Design a protein around this ligand. Structure first.
Ligand SMILES: [Ca+2]
Lengths: 13, 14, 355
C-alpha cells in the first residue's frame, strides 16, 4: 500500500 | 506517540 | 603472473567488456600508454577495440570493449596485474557526515528528503532490457528522511549506477566509487559514509576498489544480499573492510524475501531492520511505502554510522566498527533459520544507536 501522507500511514498502522 | 518498529529497534525515541 | 576472472554466476556475466587492472603503483600516463599499446597490437591482428574509461585514484587500469579473443595478448601487456570480464549488479543528527548513495535515480524534490540530497551529475547504467526511482528514494528516506529517517541531520550525495530495472555493472560501480574519491580530493569535507545497496557475484576488482577506498579513510556500508546464501560469494558484500549488513524483522527473525531472503555467514558484520521498513515512495511528493531487503538493513547502519561519526569525528574505520558491534543487541536473532554450520559463523548482532 502506498500512503499519500505520513498522517495516512499513522491512522492505518 | 507512535514510532515505526525499525526506528524503535535501533534505539530511536519519540 | 597476470590472471583472468569472470563472474561464477553465468547469467550475470557481461562478455565483450573487460576491466584491465594494473599493478598498484602504475601511473595514469603508463595506464593510458598500455591501453593505446593494446589498441595497436589488436589492430595488427584485425581487431577493433574501444577504450571506455581509464581508471586512476583507487585502482590503475582501464575499461576496454573488445573480443575475448584478445585476452591472451592483453594478459602479456606491461604492468597488467589481472583482467576481469564485466558483470551485473542488482538493487537489493549525523550533520558532520556526507552520505554517498550509489543506486537508482532518486526523486530529490520528495518532501521527505528535499534539501538533504544533492543529486550529482554521475550516471553509468546498462541499457534497459515513479518506477526508476523507487529503490533509491526509499533508501535515501531511510538514511535521512524527515519523518521516517535514521540520521535526519545527515546530508546525502546521490550517484546513479542502477538503471530503471535496478540493474548496474561492476564497471559502472567502479567508476562511481572512483568519482567519490575524486570529489573528495577536489573539495574535501568531513567523514564520508558510502552506501552500496546492491550486489553481484564475487568480484576481485570490486573488492579491491572497496579495500582501496577503505584504506583511504572512507566508510563503506553494503547490503549482504537477498539470496539466502553465504555473503562471501557476493560483491561488494565479501570485501572484508566494508560493513556488510544482513536483514532482520520485528520478530527477531532473519528476513524471508520470497523463496529467498537475507544472506549470512562470516562476511556479514551485523544485521539490522530489513522487513516492513516504512519510507519515502516516489509515487508522489508526500508518499510513503513499506519495503524490505538487505538494502534497507544497510541504510539503517549507514544512518547509525553517520551519527556515530558526527558525535565522534576522529573514530577510525576499525574503531567505528568496534562501536557498531559494541552497541548492537546481542543474541536476539533466531540462529535456527540459518543453515547449521553457518550458525557459529554468522554474527548474532542487531545494529543500534548508543543509548
Ligand atoms: Ca566486514
Amino acid at each position: 500500500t502506498v500512503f499519500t501522507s505520513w498522517e495516512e500511514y499513522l491512522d492505518w498502522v | 506517540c507512535f514510532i515505526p518498529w525499525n526506528l524503535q529497534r535501533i534505539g530511536l525515541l519519540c | 603472473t597476470a590472471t583472468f576472472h569472470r563472474c561464477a554466476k553465468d547469467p550475470w556475466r557481461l562478455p565483450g567488456t573487460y576491466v584491465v587492472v594494473l599493478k598498484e603503483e602504475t601511473h595514469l600516463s603508463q595506464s593510458e600508454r598500455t591501453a593505446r599499446r593494446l589498441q595497436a597490437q589488436a589492430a595488427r591482428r584485425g581487431y577493433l577495440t574501444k577504450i571506455l574509461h581509464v581508471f586512476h585514484g583507487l585502482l590503475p587500469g582501464f575499461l576496454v570493449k573488445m573480443s575475448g579473443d584478445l585476452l591472451e595478448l592483453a594478459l602479456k601487456l606491461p604492468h597488467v596485474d589481472y583482467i576481469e570480464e564485466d558483470s551485473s549488479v542488482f538493487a537489493q543528527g549525523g550533520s558532520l557526515v556526507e552520505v554517498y548513495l550509489l543506486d537508482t535515480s532518486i526523486q530529490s524534490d520528495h518532501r521527505e528528503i528535499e534539501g538533504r540530497v544533492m543529486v550529482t551529475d554521475f550516471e553509468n547504467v546498462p541499457e534497459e532490457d515513479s518506477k526508476c526511482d523507487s529503490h533509491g528514494t526509499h533508501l535515501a528516506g531511510v538514511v535521512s528522511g524527515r519523518d521516517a529517517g535514521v540520521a535526519k541531520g545527515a546530508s546525502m550525495r546521490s550517484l546513479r549506477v542502477l538503471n530503471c530495472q535496478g540493474k548496474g555493472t561492476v564497471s559502472g560501480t567502479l567508476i562511481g566509487l572512483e568519482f567519490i574519491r575524486k570529489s573528495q580530493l577536489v573539495q574535501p569535507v568531513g567523514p564520508l559514509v558510502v552506501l552500496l545497496p546492491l550486489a553481484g557475484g564475487y568480484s576481485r576488482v570490486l573488492n579491491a576498489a572497496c579495500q582501496r577506498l577503505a584504506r583511504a579513510g572512507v566508510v563503506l556500508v553494503t547490503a549482504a544480499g537477498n539470496f539466502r546464501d553465504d555473503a562471501c560469494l557476493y560483491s561488494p558484500a565479501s570485501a572484508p573492510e566494508v560493513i556488510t549488513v544482513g536483514a532482520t524483522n520485528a520478530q527477531d527473525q532473519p528476513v524471508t524475501l520470497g523463496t529467498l531472503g537475507t544472506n549470512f555467514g562470516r562476511c556479514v558484520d551485523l544485521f539490522a531492520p530489513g522487513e516492513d521498513i516504512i519510507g519515502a515512495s516516489s509515487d508522489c511528493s508526500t508518499c510513503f511505502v513499506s519495503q524490505s531487503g538487505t538494502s534497507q538493513a544497510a541504510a539503517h547502519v549507514a544512518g547509525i554510522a553517520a551519527m556515530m561519526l558526527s558525535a565522534e569525528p576522529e573514530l577510525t574505520l576499525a574503531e567505528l566498527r568496534q562501536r557498531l558491534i559494541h552497541f548492537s543487541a546481542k543474541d536476539v536473532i533466531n540462529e535456527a533459520w540459518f543453515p547449521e554450520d553457518q550458525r557459529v559463523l554468522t554474527p548474532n548482532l542487531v545494529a543500534a544507536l548508543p543509548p
